[PDB]
Amino acid sequence: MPMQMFMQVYDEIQMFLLEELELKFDMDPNRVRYLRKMMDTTCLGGKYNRGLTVIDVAESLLSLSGARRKRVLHDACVCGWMIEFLQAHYLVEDDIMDNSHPDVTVQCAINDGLLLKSWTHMMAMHFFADRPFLQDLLCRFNRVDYTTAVGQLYDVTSMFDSNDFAEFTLSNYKRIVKYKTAYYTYLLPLVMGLIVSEALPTVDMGVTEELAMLMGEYFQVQDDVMDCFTPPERLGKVGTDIQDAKCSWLAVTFLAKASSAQVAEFKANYGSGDSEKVATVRRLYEEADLQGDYVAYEAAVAEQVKELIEKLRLCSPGFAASVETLWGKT
Template identity: 40%
Template sequence: SMLDYNVLGGKLNRGLAVVESYKLLKAGSEPSEEEEFLACILGWGIEWLQAYFLILDDIMDNSQTRRGKPCWYRLPKVGLIAINDGLVLRSQISRIFKRYFHGKPYYVDLLDLFNEVDFKTTSGELLDQITTSEGQKDLSKYTVDVYRRIVEYKTAYYSFYLPVGCALLLSGGSLDDYVQVKHILVEMGIYFQIQDDYLDCFGDPEVMGKIGTDIEDFKCSWLFVQALVRVDERQKDILFENYGKSDPACVAKVKALYKELNLEAVFSEYEREIYEKLISDIEAQPNEAVQAVLKSFLHKIYRRMK
């Protein structure tokens, strides 16, 4: 069915993160079966949200495959009906939440959180689309600041802040008291995406499970924006000449330039700095259970590179 095809098949990281975060927040007291069940419902809510984003994203990007299968809209019987399927997924979330959370003290805050994150993610997608079409005309539009904004809105909120926000609400917290936690999670989300961009070029496709296409796809990638601030005129010409072309020879030239600019070392240095900064920000958190949640996220991200 449409649900099995689109909601299942990922790693379910975001959904599982709700349950894990909730257990860490309840440190010292075992959650009841009812509470754990509700944490699972919230986790599935995020997975449905993710499925809705991906279905529509794949149509916009004209993608071929997702999670090792053809994209949903590419199936002959589906086509553009996929747009409605995406909307069905999104509207079901509200109904599921109504069924299980209506009357709970955090019900309004929960709907608010999902609406806010939905808004941020779709705004990030819009920013990404606009930037890419601008970039196709003029690559110097791809700057470090533009990159950060896209990633923060498009990925960081729903992948990192949302699961923890759900767990905090379920454990009786008020999100207004955790503004600093939100900042830390968004920063982690940006770090995660930078890793992703790095691995798209330098990672092993066997390990990644996919072949990177950021260069061919004209992506405003972290490697590109870092290259742009480091090139001399000659290198800049090579970069602009070959970026966004599907010809393997062009892609190879861009990769060679990334190596020449020593971006692997730039990445390692960035990674070391951001890791230290995140650790010190986390350790400044007054609540130990919250610290534990943030550290578990950070170590998961960090482990991808090892």
Template identity: 35%
Template sequence: MESSRNLKMKFDDLFDVLVKDLTENQPADTSPALKWFQQVLLYNVPHGKKNRGLTVVQSYEFLIGEKKEMSDEDFKITAVVGWCIELLQAFFLVSDDVMDHSITRRGRPCWYTVPGVGLIAMNDALYIESSVYKLLKKYIRNKPYYIDIVDLFHETIHQTIVGQCLDLLTSKEVNLDGFTLDRYNAIVKYKTAYYSFHLPVACAIYMVGINDERSHQLAKDILLKMGEYFQVQDDYLDCFGDPELTGKLGTDIEDNKCSWLIVQAWSKADNRQKEILKVNYGKPEECNLKMVKMVYEELNLRTVYEDYEAKSFQEISKLIEGIDSCLPKTMFNEFAKKIYKRNK
């Protein structure tokens, strides 16, 4: 299997080709829009860790096994699908940042805050989404799995939008009693787990010709659990992570987000601590932030998180060990190791 560094370099090299596909040889009277969209793509798409996109390529390698070497054509097609997921990620992030009034993303100002952009960013987000289907049509239209992949993207977008709606509605809650573990798990599953974990691997599974329902369901069960674990990590890092490593300033407390930390805190707090949380959670001032974090420290949520992390990893490992289909256990184990105890 190719080294991660070489794989990432080859993956990155394809991006400029795809930008040209999307912005060149188009109707002349759309020229101003195309110049703008080129900026949109270059600013918003290629600067993340690219884990989702690379996962398509890596999954494909695992699935074809050692008996067959990935051809240049195999790489290109899987990388294109991977970049489509990176585009999808950018679509979600650009619109999400507007809705959440976020300030930074991947260590840079959010796109909508860039001078001259503003709410044009919402149209830019829609443009990025539509680009996914332009590329899928260009590169895999004649493949037997085309319909399955397109359908998977449509379904995943719908799931993620449902999750975002749950997240936004919950963040409007005045009463923290609505911040339950059930609500949190629903937000995580739909907003994050489907597109971040299930989509990349499911694409690769279809691309190698595995279509049986059982294999896809086994993969989904494991990947959604990984997605839950990943989001809990994200929530923890939003509060306790180093912005130099994460690339963003956490705003879950100020934004009244139904994060894993507030769900845990509310379920464990005594009356005094609940009163502090009621008064300060969802407020923008530094003093409010400090009071919430004080309660988090009193409740020893760092240790609660460490216990969750260990238990969750064990549950994921058990699910992987129970695989009884053609899916390779090594693939899931490698992906689980990558996210275990991450700090960014």
């Protein structure tokens, strides 16, 4: 029922957006169909974990506070699609960076990026035009989107000096994860589920914010290890962090426990496309027992997670229910 509902509201949002273009923005049918396909292609086909989390939070809060039900849930669905569309926007932006007379496909990818983000505003202004929370929703949403762009800057410049391994530390790794991933993937759906459920000021936000960061950290450490050690046809992509000299959990953990000569061997081989240099890096990570340390690190985070939901439940018990479901996904 959650997914079947989420997908129906998608059709509803899509038809409003495309009818709006045709009726209020003078769009020809050829371009409407082109945008219907681009929307389908960029917004559909993931797991919808961010979007469904809004619904899950919402349903858990109408069970522990008729017509308010179906409206809060519909609101929840539109909120989840705002996050999915924002996610679509970020993935188009990432594609432009690596994909490369006016190049009309790059022009259209830029244009797609702008439209996907504006669509989050358009669907909110329409479907929440009459809700008292529209303005708070907008600001919290805009602020989390800013946070993400700030975290993208931290990430993309982690190996340089904005006009290098000094920023390859664990606290900075956590800064990158917090801003680039945790705020919009974990905190934002939780917060939107509370906004549409009217229950915003009823929760310890500090513990909530703390839990979102920790879950994103757990998720990203596993992600970093799989990028390096899960082979492509099992990972789903070609893992590229070593070539791209990412500030990954493996890299910052290796630097803390490597010998001087090893660090020199790591520094000489990192950030290179050459297959033996990447293999040398994997060899070093292996010999440092990083996949051993991976298990322990996640365990400790899980304990902080498995224990931090309980504070949250002392004053907001239904919230804590969905936060555990979100955590079970991670």
